[PDB]
Design a protein around this nucleic acid. Structure first.
Lengths: 110, 136, 179, 80, 32, 49
RNA sequence: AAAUGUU
RNA sequence: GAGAGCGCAAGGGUAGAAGGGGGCCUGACUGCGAGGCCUGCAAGCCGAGCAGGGGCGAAAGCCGGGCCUAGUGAACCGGUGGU
RNA sequence: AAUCCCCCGUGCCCAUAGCGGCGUGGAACCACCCGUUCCCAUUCCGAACACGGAAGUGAAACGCGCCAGCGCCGAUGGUACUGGGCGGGCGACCGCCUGGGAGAGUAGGUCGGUGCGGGGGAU
RNA sequence: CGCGGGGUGGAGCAGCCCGGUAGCUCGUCGGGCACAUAACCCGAAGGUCGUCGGUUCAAAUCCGGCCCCCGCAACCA
């Protein structure tokens, strides 16, 4: 009935509880390094992101760093987003990281 | 008359209204008033319908006993643990069909469920088939 | 020998594609893993067989883990819900076509009765169990090396649909039938 | 038993109902549900004690809702 | 893949079988 | 209280205890752990009684 | 120290 | 559709898991407590948040004994360690 | 963008959203897929988790599309039960006046509804 | 219905204070001495501990049912 994507619905859920913080959800497919900043208590998307909207291509992995370096400036362009987090799909390693290290340039407090 | 592998061994009392409509044999004696009915009157009528018939007859019994008795045996001042169960009873509230018949449609068959409903302290009545409703 | 059997498969099956369809090649018949279960259950005594049997199958193929619990505590022998029982090994891609053609071609008539390996009625519906093997007849080793050989198992699995989608496959590969 | 009556053993009972029904402005610390097992999951601004007792966490109005398949939730919504 | 514990199988296919014509399996009894 | 014991652990530097329970049969090896006394250092106490 | 035997 | 399991009895509950397996460790701790449910008194029970000093985590965060309801008995009179 | 239409992430209604049967997709997106040094990991296995990436393919998985055999909700009309009043019975128990009013069954219902944000098509 | 004790070879009995390991006395069979018996002298066979399940590395031994044997009192049709 549920085919081993149970951890994603269990880990994310345990996060909703503390609704004093806003989330960024990433996707990590191949030409698809996406992220979204969701404000939780009103279900919208507060600001978008990019992997192929902003093109920034090549044949590499450092585009994962590039996307977080875009999210830093695009967060403080509205400036209010001081407090946020980051989940992901499954294991948190290389590809899913550089997004965190790119958001750590703008002072996103994680 | 086995009721084996019981759940609970002592029970309670009180019952007033009842249902369970007409059955579908050829003839069945139908009740009118409520009464407890033991496990021995049933056997008495089961013998007296059979040995009337023709050394052959068939009978469908539709009443079965569950509720146990108590007696507190002979000369006891009251106020202890109510025990010592014994042979034990059923319940028929106004109208459900007892003892439907083999279906040989004669007064040869219609007399036996007069002489069987002549023990069995309820007051009975005799019917036949034109009902034909629907259930599950 | 591995590429030598690779080209045997991949130059007999496109010759033998000519009985079904020709469309959707990546949707016909293919092989999968092989599980081998020792299944002794005789080490309800000391854990001496858990090391001694783990150096001949693990010297033919990959290492031999202790997938060995027993899940329950029936009668027979007070196993003590636990211990070890199973001695499973899994083979996937390379040791796969080491072990398959090594047991098939240049070793197998060291067994007696010589009726291939198949009494032609495996009667699977899904992925088609097989496996007729008593332990330590001809793997590579020297003539006793243990006491009390104990009988092994083999269970190939495929991606076939009817019975003949692996009957025809494993017969055009080899594997002599008929009782 | 043996051949008599061996009963007459019972225990004085706890209360464990619902104390703070719909409406009813409460302040931070009041107990909302005494229960024995989880029959009312917590919502926002409602904590869950050691033996499954819900209690208000900030001030406001107790508001019941449901979810259907998942289950009944309670939560206290801020005052103005 | 654990790289230390599994046994060594670098050249344990490339031989003829450590002597095949004494193993009695190649042309051995399987024919009709 | 047949096998359980009321043991009462003291320090590696000083005075009185911090009152706990022990089994005496399945462990036997004179336990030791780490705690905060009223001299504010988070030292390690020892089973002393 | 240490027994009995007509059927 | 959970009908299995969770140290011991029955009821409530639970796989968006309190259930089974490995990684590191003692928060089975100390000026301490707004506010309540229950109650003839005495008892029992839950508890957000500050300060000291610490474990696990990239961070968010969680921890002042155990999935929960039973394993306990006021004072007086005495014993051993510090102030 | 600021007029419509397919695809890709997230939420809420909460099985009239499901199971089972046959067709239909890759130009763009997506998943199988090719390899195995370091980045990593498998009580054994790159089967999962992770890394570097052309082809070949949409068969398996996934989305739109259809068909009610299985499930899932289900009227109107009645009756049981009863809050409040009065009656008849040796005993189990029944009747009428006035306000409420179920459960099972019957005709039937559907193979979902809906926001927020990105990439393309009609410019 | 009740009060307590017990189920060990053919019969009678130890082993159960506290988990490891089965023995004794009568008694059946076979060979001895003796004109044939009795008595006496050697040797062997005969079970798991009523019956079914739980707890531990291990139950005659600790726990739960099921069924038998020993003694005391009141009564049914």
């Amino acid at each position: 009935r549920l085919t081993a994507y149970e951890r994603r619905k269990f880990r994310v859920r345990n996060r909703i509880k503390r609704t004093g913080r806003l989330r960024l959800s990433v996707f990590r497919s191949l030409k698809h390094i996406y992220a979204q900043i969701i404000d939780d208590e009103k279900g919208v998307t507060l600001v978008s992101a990019s992997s192929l909207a902003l093109k920034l291509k090549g044949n590499k992995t450092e585009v994962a760093r590039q996307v977080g370096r875009a999210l830093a400036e695009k967060a403080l362009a509205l400036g209010i987003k001081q407090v946020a987090f980051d989940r992901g799909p499954y294991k948190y390693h290389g590809r899913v990281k550089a997004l965190a290290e790119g958001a750590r340039e703008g002072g996103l407090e994680f | 008359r086995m009721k084996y592998r019981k759940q609970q061994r002592g029970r309670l009392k009180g019952a007033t209204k009842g249902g369970d409509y007409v059955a579908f044999g050829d003839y069945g004696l139908v009740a009118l008033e409520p009464a407890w009915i033991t496990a021995q009157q049933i056997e008495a009528a089961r013998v007296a319908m059979v040995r009337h018939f023709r050394r052959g007859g068939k009978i469908f019994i539709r009443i079965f006993p569950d509720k146990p008795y108590t007696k507190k045996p002979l000369e006891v001042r009251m106020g202890k643990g109510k025990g010592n169960v014994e042979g034990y009873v059923a319940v028929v509230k106004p109208g459900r069909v007892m003892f439907e018949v083999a279906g040989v449609t004669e007064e040869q068959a219609m007399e036996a469920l007069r002489i069987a409903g002549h023990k069995l302290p309820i007051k009975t009545k005799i019917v036949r088939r034109d009902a034909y409703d629907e259930a599950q | 020998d591995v590429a030598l059997k690779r080209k045997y498969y991949e130059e007999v099956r496109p010759e033998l594609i000519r009985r079904f369809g020709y469309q959707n090649v990546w949707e016909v018949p293919r092989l999968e893993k092989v599980v081998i279960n020792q299944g002794l259950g005789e080490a309800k005594e000391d854990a001496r067989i858990l090391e001694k049997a783990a150096q001949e199958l693990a010297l033919i193929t990959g290492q031999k883990p202790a997938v060995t619990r027993a899940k329950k505590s029936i009668s027979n022998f007070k196993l003590r819900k636990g211990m070890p029982i199973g001695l499973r090994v899994t083979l996937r891609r390379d040791r796969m076509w080491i072990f398959l053609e090594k047991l098939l071609n240049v070793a197998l008539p060291r067994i007696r009765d010589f009726r291939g390996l198949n009494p032609n009625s495996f009667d699977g519906r899904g992925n088609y169990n097989l496996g007729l093997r008593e332990q330590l007849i001809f793997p590579e080793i020297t003539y006793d090396m243990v006491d009390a050989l104990r009988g092994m198992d083999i269970a190939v699995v495929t991606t076939a649909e009817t019975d003949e989608e692996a009957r025809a496959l494993l017969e055009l590969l080899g594997f002599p039938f008929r009782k | 038993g043996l051949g008599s009556t061996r009963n007459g053993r019972d225990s004085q009972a706890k209360r464990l109902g619902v104390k703070r029904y719909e409406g009813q402005v409460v302040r931070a610390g009041n107990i909302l549900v005494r229960q024995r097992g989880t029959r009312f999951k917590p919502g926002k601004n409602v904590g869950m004690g050691r033996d499954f007792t819900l209690f208000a966490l900030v001030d406001g109005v107790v508001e019941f809702q449901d979810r259907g398949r998942l289950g009944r939730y309670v939560h206290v919504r801020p005052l103005a | 893949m654990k790289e230390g514990i599994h046994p060594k199988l670098v050249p344990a296919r490339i031989i003829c079988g450590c002597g095949n014509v004494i193993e009695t399996y190649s042309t051995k009894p399987e024919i009709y | 209280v047949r096998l359980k014991l009321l043991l009462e652990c003291t320090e590696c530097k000083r005075r009185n205890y911090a009152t706990e329970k022990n089994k005496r049969n399945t462990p036997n090896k004179l336990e030791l752990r780490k705690y905060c006394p009223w001299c504010r250092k988070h030292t390690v106490h020892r089973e002393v009684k």
